[PDB]
Design a protein around this nucleic acid. Structure first.
Lengths: 50, 50, 153
DNA sequence: CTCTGAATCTCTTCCCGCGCGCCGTAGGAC
DNA sequence: GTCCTATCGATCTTCGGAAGAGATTCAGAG
């Protein structure tokens, strides 16, 4: 059902949608959407389970 | 079983971490732009944020 | 062709904005993407934004916003900041290249021990490039003479 | 092709007195 | 040191409110 609701296609599409909804007014870029995604939940500066 | 107790030695630690994060934010740039030769570690940091 | 682009910058830090861009261009070695970043100044009309000679690449779009004290450019849309104009550059390069003490007038001293005081002109020391303004000392309007650069009009 | 449904968004509301206590612009240039 | 100009003009403001109602967008179809 989520697949039926998904308007995105692939990893590039995933980064584009994530970047647009995360930062309205900010243009997506392949080198930059990673800089957003990794910092979201994988980068120590902004994620740490105690 | 889902709520845990933070005490002084943890909240103070978090605040100290915040201070150090601000200090790092400044001094990373200072070291990138600094000449790194005449600089001494006292020059790198200033106590005021912490 | 590197069309100029206008960038918002921390007022009072505008010099550090231009320098912090100047370092970052070479460090990111995008020297082939930037001309110079103009901060015109007279003896700085608008404590505010900067002009950068630049091209429009997404790497350069993020590069300028990766310099400290830089929100970004001023343009129609954030996706594409716009240059200024053909003639606007020339006009700015043109300007970047291109009050008498009346008797009875009330002024303040600009410097010295009497700076920022309520004084009244008493006479005219014109040809000496000087001034003479009454002051309130000892309870009197004593005659005190000052330099020309002590005016506060 | 846009008309009445819902569906999702923003804006607004939340008793009353008393009494302490403290805390209250910032950075850098001449 | 005093006296000046200015606001994260390279962040991330707090997720532990309900609710109640309008306003604003979107369906199934005439």
């Amino acid at each position: 059902e989520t697949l039926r609701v998904d308007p995105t296609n692939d990893r590039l599409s995933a980064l584009v949608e994530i970047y647009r909804m995360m930062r309205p007014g900010e243009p997506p870029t392949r080198e930059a959407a990673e800089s957003l995604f990794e910092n979201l939940f994988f980068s120590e500066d902004r994620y740490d389970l105690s | 079983g889902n709520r845990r107790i933070r005490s002084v030695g943890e909240m103070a630690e978090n605040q100290f971490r915040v201070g150090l994060v601000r200090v790092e934010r400044a001094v990373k740039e200072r070291l990138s732009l600094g000449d790194l030769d005449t600089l001494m570690p006292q020059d790198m940091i200033n106590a005021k944020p912490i | 062709k590197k069309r100029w682009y206008v960038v918002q910058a921390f007022s009072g830090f505008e010099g550090r904005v231009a320098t912090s861009l100047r370092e970052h261009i070479k460090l990111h070695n995008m020297e082939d993407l930037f001309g110079e970043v103009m901060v015109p100044t007279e003896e700085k009309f608008f404590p505010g934004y900067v002009l950068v000679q630049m091209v429009m690449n997404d790497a350069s779009w993020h590069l300028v916003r990766s310099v400290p004290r830089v929100m970004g450019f001023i343009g129609g849309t954030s996706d594409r900041p716009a240059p200024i104009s053909d003639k606007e550059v020339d006009a700015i390069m043109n300007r970047l290249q291109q009050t008498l003490f009346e008797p009875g007038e009330m002024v303040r001293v600009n410097d010295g021990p009497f700076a920022d005081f309520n004084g009244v002109v008493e006479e005219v020391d014109y040809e000496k490039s000087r001034l003479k303004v009454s002051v309130s000392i000892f309870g009197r309007a004593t005659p005190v003479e000052l330099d020309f650069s002590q005016v506060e009009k």
